[PDB]
């Protein structure tokens, strides 16, 4: 009748701009995992995440991972603008061989790992105004060392703390020192957080240890872009409506195929 009960099992690359993350998740692309750096500054109507994607950098968690994912996914871009943070008194550009960028050590491209310089680590107090007419998205993190000895060797202070403020948000994080299961060789962890700065607002960062610093901001847009988890191959054909199962005809008013859809689709109808 006029419930669409079949899909093709493939995802058409037209008319929508489809971006395949073969081996990369959107968050991993956002952070700049070295095997994901081909995605720098990429845009998309629909980002397609595969179940064969893997992280190959510093082990990390994102509190509210789903929300960061969906907001980047709906913005439709990874436009990153590098900004001139001044990190006085610390060593910048820390890397780890659990995240190689070729021969030597590496880190996420969009993050700046700060450690002591000499044997002091000062209280960083940095500001970054937003004088533009758009929303700035800042990604940053905090390092959770395995042991008290590792905490003191990297950041001097026995206990660190990160505080990021706007006038519309406040994020104060203290590291959680402790041993985690070996992941790609590491017992330590990084936690990732994010901060939106509206025009005329100013980003404030204060830290006496464990700060993983931002390098700049991602240009926030307001889009009809989105993201989808699917293993359907991408074919060069035409379809206005896409599901994780593949493309579907959109002439019939309804569809049994999947509640998740992108494009001008018939309505899901519970069979």
């Amino acid at each position: 009748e006029l419930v669409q009960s079949s899909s093709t099992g493939k995802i058409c690359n037209n008319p929508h701009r489809i971006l395949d993350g073969i081996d990369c998740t959107l968050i991993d692309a956002l952070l700049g995992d070295p095997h994901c750096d081909v995605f720098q500054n990429e845009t998309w109507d629909l980002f397609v995440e595969r179940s064969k994607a893997f992280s190959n950098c510093y082990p990390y968690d994102v509190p509210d991972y789903a929300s960061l994912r969906s907001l980047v996914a709906s913005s439709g871009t990874l436009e990153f603008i590098t900004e001139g943070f001044t990190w006085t008194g610390v060593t910048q550009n820390g890397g780890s061989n659990a995240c190689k960028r070729g021969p030597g050590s590496g880190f996420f491209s969009r993050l700046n790992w700060l450690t002591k310089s000499g044997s002091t680590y000062p209280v960083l107090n940095v500001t970054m105004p937003n004088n533009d007419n758009f929303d700035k998205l800042y990604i940053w993190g905090i390092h959770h060392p395995s042991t008290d000895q590792e905490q003191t060797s990297l950041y001097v202070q026995a206990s660190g703390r990160v505080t990021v403020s706007t006038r519309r948000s406040q994020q104060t994080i203290i590291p959680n020192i402790g041993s985690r299961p070996w992941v790609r060789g590491l017992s330590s962890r990084i936690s990732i957080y994010w901060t939106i700065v509206k025009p005329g607002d100013v980003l404030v960062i204060n830290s006496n240890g464990n700060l993983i610093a931002p390098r700049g901001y991602f240009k926030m847009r307001t889009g009809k872009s989105s993201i989808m988890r699917s293993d359907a191959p991408i074919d060069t054909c035409i379809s206005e409506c896409i599901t994780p199962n593949g493309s579907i005809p959109n002439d019939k008013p309804f569809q049994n195929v999947n509640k998740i859809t992108y494009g001008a689709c018939p309505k899901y109808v519970k069979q």
Partner: antibody, heavy 116, light 114 residues
Framework: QVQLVESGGGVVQPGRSLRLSCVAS????????MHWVRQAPGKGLEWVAV????????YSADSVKGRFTISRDNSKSTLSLQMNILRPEDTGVYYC?????????WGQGTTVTVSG | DIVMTQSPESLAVSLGERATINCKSS????????????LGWYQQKPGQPPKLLIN???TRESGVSDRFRGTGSGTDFTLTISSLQAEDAAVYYC?????????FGQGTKLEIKR
């Protein structure tokens, strides 16, 4: 002395559940990653699950994902394995083991027989 | 997911000769191009829990005899028992703890040749 003692094994019907427990002694239990490994009769070692110092991160093998849950109780120095929807192929001796990179301390194990 | 493959599955060695068990991992279990290798060797005799013999591919555990040696770095690993004694008869296992899911080799039965 440094010791782990497992408990809770038994004969259980398929599809049922039972909870294994391991009590640690003679070391700072709360500071150690802890594992469950098992071994079916006449078969090789099979890694089951692992959990961080605080129970905040765990991992389990794909043969048990969705069915077995690992947790600890640092105030009782107690590792746990909650086993749901048991199947005959889950039969084996289950060990709790401390991580020192390579698993340097093991209990004597507790035996689970899943059968009708 | 990293898979461990041991070799041979079964081995017979005369008393006082050397034994050699081989272990291969499907992906590297080394930290960088470092010498840190997340690889353990175990010995298990009937009715007993395994015993960690070698840690970090080469480091002999406390109380383990001189005769046991391990090496390798990356994917290929070797365990040696140099002047075989009757107490050595047992199953040996390798084990990767680089990244989860962790996993054991399938086991190698070392028996006394007569």
């Amino acid at each position: 002395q440094v010791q782990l003692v497992e408990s809770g094994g038994g004969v259980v019907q398929p599809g049922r559940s039972l909870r294994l427990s391991c009590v640690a002694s003679g070391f700072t239990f709360r500071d150690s990653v802890m594992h469950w490994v098992r071994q079916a009769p006449g078969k090789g070692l099979e890694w089951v699950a692992v959990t961080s110092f605080d129970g905040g991160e765990s991992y389990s093998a794909d043969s048990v994902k969705g069915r077995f849950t690992i947790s600890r109780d640092n105030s009782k120095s107690t590792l746990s394995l909650q086993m749901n929807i048991l199947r005959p192929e889950d039969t084996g001796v289950y060990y709790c083991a401390r991580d020192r990179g390579g698993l340097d301390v093991w209990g004597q194990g507790t035996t689970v027989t899943v059968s009708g | 997911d990293i898979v461990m493959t041991q070799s041979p599955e079964s081995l017979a060695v005369s008393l006082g000769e050397r034994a050699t068990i081989n272990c291969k991992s499907s992906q590297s279990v080394s930290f960088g191009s470092s010498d840190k290798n997340y690889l353990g060797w175990y010995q298990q005799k009937p009715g007993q829990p395994p015993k960690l013999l070698i840690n970090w591919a080469s480091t002999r555990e406390s109380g383990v005899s001189d005769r046991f040696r391990g090496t390798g770095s990356g994917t290929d690993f070797t365990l040696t028992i140099s002047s075989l004694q009757a107490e050595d008869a047992a199953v040996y296992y390798c084990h990767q703890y680089y990244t989860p899911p962790y996993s054991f080799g399938q086991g190698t039965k070392l028996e006394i040749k007569r």
